[PDB]
Design a protein around this ligand. Structure first.
Ligand SMILES: Nc1nc2c(ncn2[C@@H]2O[C@H](COP(=O)(O)OP(=O)(O)OP(=O)(O)O)[C@@H](O)[C@H]2O)c(=O)[nH]1
Lengths: 111, 180, 98
RNA sequence: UGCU
DNA sequence: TTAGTATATGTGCTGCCGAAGTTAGCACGCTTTCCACAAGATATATAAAGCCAAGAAATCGAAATACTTTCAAGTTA
DNA sequence: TAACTTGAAAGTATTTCGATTTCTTGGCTTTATATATCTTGTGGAAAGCGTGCTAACTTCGGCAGCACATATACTAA
């Protein structure tokens, strides 16, 4: 038996209710240094979103795809320069930069 | 099918309540609605504004004095409904309901009417407070619709002579909304 | 489905309404839980006159309902003193039962 | 349900 | 071999409750699976606006002090 | 018999402060066209309790059973 485990809710007016149409997505915005390192990751990998999402643990692959589409629609010259420039794939230094970004967002939250 | 049958007879019924009682989500609901209407091609009469206004005004409990709501908030039904109808007609003629959801505008109109019927005791009441008192789910864009309707009312005040001299604002034009 | 079911979506609001409407209009009451099958419970109010209506409002039907010409319940019993009108009775086949 |  | 006795022989009696049929004259009036075919769920502009929730700035509300008023009792006269 | 310098006594005013509102962000919804493929969303056809009252007359009207009696064939003297 439920021993006062839940509380009654005074919701769902029998009169009527409306729609929402927006439930879950609720993305989170980027920053300047984050956009810089994102362009770096683009120049380093390409357009394959699987690897980008794997290397970005704290940002979603859908958000990454939305950002890439927004960049393709607004700033084309930047994407062109990114594809022009190339960098060999780095793993240890990339994890170090990930830790640096974690520390930076921690400092931001502190601020 | 229920919605089309309800529309064919000029009967107001909100798709929100339909989805609530149908165990479905608005996204898939609208998708399948568009698919079926494109596949059938049946007449889809537009949702009349006055009928929905009356249906939503009948929901509010500011007509009979209940234990929770004091007598000060209780107002007349016929006069408040007429005021809400005039306000929503003004909104429809001023390009406020076109392209936007109608129910937020209806809520803003009935709130402005309830405040204008007695501006004194309700100058401090807010939209969220009114929604809590009436036991109605507060629409999100209702605030923006209210802010736009109040701007339109301020423009009407500026057009009028005595009000433009009084130099009212979005908080003091509620007492003259009736004259507008 | 995983969607939790609640009664509000099947709470029939017309069942009781139609039941009461039919029971009052048709006049036939069929209660299966009690095995009661009665007829002629409700009758059209006779608006022939105010006296007619006032007299029909205070009528009494019997459980017999013209089953046999027993003459027993149809006869006027001394037990009706001060309770029912001895002289007021419809003239015809329903003499003594109404 | 009333009427004879 | 014949009188006394047991049985079944159909017969005839009794109740047995029920069986059909009766009651007069008008005007009103759900489950398993099994099954197969086509429909989720998927990239992708794409212009467009409205919506629904974090943040940042703004101003309203008002509370704890700083001025002035006001008495009322007391001073120089 | 007044007049001015007292005191703690109000409003009364303004200045900042809690808080809620308003203003910004994305991002998804939707419009069409087709391009293409996995398992799992279904269509559809099968098939392996429980009462009450009698509504009462008439005159069946049979059979149930039963059951009583006895005529006869078997058996003891
Ligand atoms: N006006 C009127 N009402 C009736 C008539 N017959 C029946 N009623 C109504 O029905 C009730 C009694 O009628 P009944 O005799 O039970 O109906 P019935 O038994 O079917 O009569 P039959 O149709 O002759 O069998 C009365 O109390 C009335 O309520 C009728 O012939 N005329």
């Amino acid at each position: 038996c439920v021993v006062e485990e839940n509380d009654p809710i005074f919701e769902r007016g029998s009169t009527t209710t409306y729609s929402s149409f927006r439930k879950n997505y609720y993305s989170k915005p980027w920053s300047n240094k984050e956009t810089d390192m994102f362009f770096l990751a683009i120049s380093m990998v390409g357009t394959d979103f699987s690897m980008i999402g794997q290397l970005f643990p704290h940002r979603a692959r859908i958000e990454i795809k939305n950002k890439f589409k927004r960049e393709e629609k607004t700033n084309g010259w930047r994407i062109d320069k990114a594809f022009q420039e190339k960098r060999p794939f780095d793993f240890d230094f990339f994890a170090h930069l990930l830790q640096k970004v974690l520390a930076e967002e921690e400092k931001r939250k502190q601020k | 099918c229920v919605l089309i049958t309800c529309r064919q007879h000029n009967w107001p019924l909100t798709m929100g309540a339909i989805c609530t009682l149908l165990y479905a989500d608005l996204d898939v609901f609208s998708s399948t609605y568009m698919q079926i209407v494109k596949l059938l091609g049946l007449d889809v009469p537009s949702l009349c504004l006055a009928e929905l206004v009356k249906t939503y005004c009948s929901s509010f409990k500011l007509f009979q004095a209940s234990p929770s709501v004091p007598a000060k908030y209780v107002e007349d039904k016929e006069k408040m409904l007429s005021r809400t109808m005039q306000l929503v007609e003004l909104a429809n003629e001023t390009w406020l309901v076109t392209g936007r959801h109608p129910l937020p505008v209806i809520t803003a109109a009935t709130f402005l009417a309830w405040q204008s019927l007695q501006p004194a005791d309700r100058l401090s009441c807010s939209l969220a407070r009114f929604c809590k008192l009436a036991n109605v789910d507060l629409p999100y864009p209702a605030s923006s619709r209210l802010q736009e309707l109040l701007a339109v009312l301020l423009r009407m005040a500026e057009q009028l002579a005595w009000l433009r001299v009084l130099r009212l604002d979005k908080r003091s034009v509620v007492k003259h909304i009736g004259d507008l | 489905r995983a969607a939790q079911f609640d009664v509000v979506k099947h709470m029939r609001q017309d069942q009781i309404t139609n039941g009461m409407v039919n029971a009052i209009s048709t006049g036939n009451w069929s209660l299966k839980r009690f095995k009661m099958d009665r007829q002629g419970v409700t009758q059209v109010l006779s608006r022939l006159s105010y006296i007619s209506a006032l007299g029909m409002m205070t009528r009494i039907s019997s459980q017999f309902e013209k089953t046999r010409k027993v003459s027993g319940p149809r006869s006027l019993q001394p037990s009706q003193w001060g309770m029912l009108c001895p002289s007021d009775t419809p003239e015809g086949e329903a003499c003594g039962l109404v």
